[PDB]
């Protein structure tokens, strides 16, 4: 049996008192993680190559994920059964090298480690065939599914309905990778088409976006014993909410009963998204490693409820010895509410001493002792409709109740382990 | 560590729209599974032979089951802790070869793969001693437990009660197997006695069946590189509800509070059940494998709320190559309501292309692409008491609301993997 | 992958009827476990030495716990993710041999097996450095966390508050072990300081204890192919509720809303605890092994709601053969309510036949068949505030409703397995 996974766990304190607190700019879809993670998260994978005969083989893989608040010993939870798929290599004679697979699977996810941000993730129940050799590149095709809560109604008259149902969203993914564009440079192109797929009799409320597209281009350049990846993505309509390749075609639906059922007009995600990203990890000599990110993401919604986000961070690593190093992480976020036009910003500085299994910025396990400082100035926030956060923003100064954190300061510190095996 | 288990997961679509739908005749206790399974189910077993000294050994085994709807990546669930037992082989000197065990265990379950129907399953918390050598056969004794919700009351003044409690049902199982009846033929006999076992002070509402018997006879004939099993079972009263060997002695109990507590008269399971079954898996030459089922099951309840069920199916497998085949599954169900006398029927046809690790109809893992068509005509259904399904049936045409599917058609298609390791 | 853990599961019956019942004296913090365990409990640990280079290494360890009532086959549950930590050995050059670790961990727990009583357990999310060699002993430092529900409020005016929050309690642990006090005798000293650590803006209700201390001294004497441990422990204030090293600084807090929020007067745990314990396991010749416990524990609370507890038990084991033995367990408990002055007592006698993997009282797996008898006479009980048990006690004879079991008798019997691997 093959045992693999990922896990992080630790104990922390907030300067002003109590447990460690984590800092994320309101409106931002991520945070700089070093010394800024407040939960124990673990994915335990058990898999096995269940059959092999020549060049043909079947691999079985699973993944059970646990997320607990690390505030006590006994902490009950509802694990997420995230993967359970079979992959058969070389089964299709005329498509030598291709792999066919079916089941829940983390499918070719693309992420930026330091901000724990996935920018291309269509994972979920699915099937497909990958690595079809085209000579000049490798072609992969896949179809996965995600479902939204509600959104499908059996309308009797007008917008009055008898029943609701969860809406399934299908994604059809095509990728071409390994395009040798320049020396030590490679390019991958990808197209994603997603659409809400309603059961017979059910229909989406008026205004639902229903479908959308997403185009991805990623260039990888090998250098300084690492790489640099340049990404450009453009998503449209239904693909803008999740923004990683999954469709949210009924996003914005809602209803109210009085008992007559009324399906409100969908406050949809019609619009577009532009994401220009550049991140990498390289070695500057013998004593220094460096991870960095620079990203501009603009979700332009027709309903004007989007956000313009800029994020920049840097994580240098100084290697005192092969198993001990000092890390520093500095990250800046700036989010402009499309609605109010105001801006929220935050910068966090983290200094950590670390012992790790290897001399790389990528070596894990790692045991860290850190101190984090974050300063933010948030001018807007989402209107907090009593414990519920709304899609609408409002300036903090307006008497309206928002989830804004205002203008403040904080520092935390503690120990933590992180590992992938 | 020994890693074993079972798992199935896939993605599907319904011809008329949305996610895949699964077809099962109302009243039938099963459905023809090929291309007719709508969930990701997995059993992860981790066990180990923890001690061995000569012919003696102790094996530890566990089993954690997960069932998710495969409609998203992150799907939280409450896993079922189904097995955790220890088996000691050859510990009893005077009963050489016998195995003593205790703990939660899937005890000698008998099922028909194609319809995923267990017809002899007393699994649960238990203990026993198996494989006592009698020379002419092997004898096994076991006691397991199951518990029903409520059913036990502390009656103050006739049927008015102070407290309720869950009712434990004990089953005492005796099996004699390996009776060589004819060349390549073997016979196994089994007796099961089950009963509701109330705590002191508590009593079952008046009318409860309390106990029952079940007798099983199974003949196995080895042939055509497979087998054919002929099964005859007769169950009595408390053994008719679950109908696989577990007792439901307080089945039908209910109560209402107004606060005075009244235990209604138990609408019991007094009656009998007859099940005549024949299933098998054989090889017809080099290119063909075949699984088949034929079953008649009649639950005759004194109160007349039972069902008479006929099911017939066939699953031929044509082997294009050792790792690629085409499967066809045709299944028919006919269920007569004992109450109304009406009949429900359905036939489903499934065509699937498959790649599997081996050239057997039993080889797993397997990756399938299928198309399923089902036609049904249901004349009756259980009276749907608003989201709640009742024990009482009603003709679909009667203005009464039932869970009947009417007269209709549907087809689905998709990909799926299934594996046992 | 290293597979380890603990598990117990079985089936039982109560003489007077129904499922097995378990006997624990009201007021007592434990019960004599042999043939007195009513659930299936299992801890599945999967770990691995993920890196090794010379004398340095990193070990990754996990632990997922399951507790089910063993009353049916399919029993859903919410597993507890109890451990997830990394330990790096020999990473600190100047502290040779020391191990640094971080993550959720069962940290150096001290318990008495026969009563399943942990008397020194600060397990939970934490970090620390253990086994610092001082020459004359080993020094270990650790900080772990536990959190109480509520207890932290944002007071606006008087005991009126706007928001509540869970209260984190930090423990700072220091231990010195391996003090060679006499031939074959060793002594370990330990100090624990814990305190509720409130978030800025929040405060504990008035009356809360906030912090406390605990001092432990444990002497181990090796003899009769076993040992004898003598323990003396003294705890103060916040350390008295859990009483094993974890702090409960806001213990007793409560509130009521009418919507104005009022934080009641904390009915605190101010006071002290004295625990004098002696337990061991030794071999008396070839055919006899013996486990024993003798403990006096007195929780003296300022508010007089404490208890004075005496427990004594013995478990001899007669070895018929190397893999078969007969066990007897006799345990007595006596608990005096500090409030009422009344006493509750119970004695349970257990006779069990056992097959185990080894000839030790410590050998596991083990399969047992037992018969248990318990007699109790409880004069007091906690005031049962309708399903809810209060901190206040009342004599059974007083017309007040308490959770007292009165004066009675009961016997149970069944089979069970227990294993640690
Ligand atoms: Ca749950």
From Swiss-Prot, chains A, B, C:
The keyword Signal applies. Disulfide bonds join 22-38. The keyword Membrane applies. Residues 1, 54-55, 91-97, 135-136, 181-184, 224-225, 285-286, 321-322, 358-364, 421 are periplasmic. InterPro entries: G_neg_Bact_CarbUptk_Porin, Maltoporin, Porin_LamB, Porin_LamB_sf. Gene3D superfamilies: Porin, LamB type. Residues 11-39, 69-79, 106-123, 149-166, 198-209, 239-269, 303-305, 339-341, 380-405 are extracellular. The record marks 118 as: Important in sugar transport. It is found in: Cell outer membrane. Belongs to the porin LamB (TC 1.B.3) family. Involved in the transport of maltose and maltodextrins. Does not act as a receptor for phages. Homotrimer formed of three 18-stranded antiparallel beta-barrels, containing three independent channels. This is Maltoporin. It comes from Salmonella typhimurium (strain LT2 / SGSC1412 / ATCC 700720).
